[PDB]
Amino acid sequence: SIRIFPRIAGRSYIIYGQTSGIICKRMEKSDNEFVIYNYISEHYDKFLKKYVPKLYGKNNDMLLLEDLTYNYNNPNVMDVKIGARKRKSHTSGFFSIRGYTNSHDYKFDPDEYLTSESTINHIKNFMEAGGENRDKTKQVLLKWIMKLSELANDLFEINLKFDGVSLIFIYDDDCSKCDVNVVDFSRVKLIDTNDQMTISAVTNLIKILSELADNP
Ligand SMILES: Nc1ncnc2c1ncn2[C@@H]1O[C@H](COP(=O)(O)OP(=O)(O)O)[C@@H](O)[C@H]1O
Ligand SMILES: O=P(O)(O)O[C@@H]1[C@H](O)[C@H](O)[C@@H](OP(=O)(O)O)[C@H](OP(=O)(O)O)[C@H]1O
Ligand SMILES: [Mg+2]
Ligand SMILES: [Mg+2]
Numbered sequence: 072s073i074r075i076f077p078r079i080a081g082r083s084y085i086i087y088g089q090t091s092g093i094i095c096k097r098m099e100k101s102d103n104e105f106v107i108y109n110y111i112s113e114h115y116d117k118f119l120k121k122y123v124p125k126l127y128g129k130n131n132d133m134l135l136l137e138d139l140t141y142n143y144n145n146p147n148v149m150d151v152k153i154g155a156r157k158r159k160s161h162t163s164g165f166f167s168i169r170g171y172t173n174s175h176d177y178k179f180d181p182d183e184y185l186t187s188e189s190t191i192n193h194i195k196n197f198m199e200a201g202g203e204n205r206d207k208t209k210q211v212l213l214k215w216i217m218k219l220s221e222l223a224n225d226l227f228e229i230n231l232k233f234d235g236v237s238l239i240f241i242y243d244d245d246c247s248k249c250d251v252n253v254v255d256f257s258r259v260k261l262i263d264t265n266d267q268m269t270i271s272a273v274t275n276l277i278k279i280l281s282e283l284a285d286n287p
Contacts, residue, residue: 079169079170081169085097094138104259108256123254125137139250149238154269164275165272179196202246208246214250223277227265230264231266235258238273
């Protein structure tokens with residue numbers, strides 16, 4: 072029977088597949104998320120390959136998605152909202168941390184508006200599972216910067232409003248593996264320009280992670 076997937080943020084009904092390495096996400100309201108996966112697949116295959124979890128297929132209202140945590144022994148996950156919010160402004164100005172592994176233990180609240188200092192403290196909290204090993208965490212930060220830089224650069228040539236999309240940052244406890252990918256295309260729209268709001272979210276994140284990777 073059904074094992075609920077340990078979501079770290081959001082609200083969607085997400086379960087493990089009956090099969091390894093697959094999560095099933097229930098679309099609500101409409102199939103827009105499906106329409107946008109297919110739209111990206113046709114018009115921007117490279118963006119889809121580099122940055123988005125594989126969509127293996129559809130089953131009524133369920134998207135069969137690549138489990139981004141599957142290849143990790145001890146995954147640590149952070150959801151950061153980089154697309155425009157529906158109704159409220161971002162909790163950290165240009166982006167909103169939505170949740171992370173053990174976030175409740177540090178009294179993280181997705182509704183709390185944060186200063187620069189609290190924003191950095193929460194990312195430091197996310198990184199705490201990495202240990203004191205100062206220069207294996209540095210390697211995790213640098214690989215995140217590498218991919219976020221390419222993403223911000225590719226977003227200039229992509230005519231989509233990434234309303235509501237999140238970065239999912241993932242690192243193993245042993246810091247042997249990490250990655251970051253974009254998810255939640257539920258509210259993404261066609262436009263005839265690039266999304267400067269979303270670009271500014273990635274560049275601000277790159278700035279913050281760079282300051283972390285550097286400081287002694
Ligand atoms: N492909 C994925 N692999 C692993 N975890 C995922 C994946 N997609 C979503 N998640 C988890 O689900 C949460 C919410 O997913 P999201 O697509 O934002 O849906 P919603 O906001 O509608 O609940 C994320 O914070 C993350 O923990
Ligand atoms: O249900 P509605 O009325 O469309 O409201 C949105 C819905 O709850 C989304 O699932 C949520 O994204 P998350 O699940 O990723 O939080 C989004 O947050 P945002 O506005 O912070 O994108 C809400 O505005
Ligand atoms: Mg979401
Ligand atoms: Mg709702």
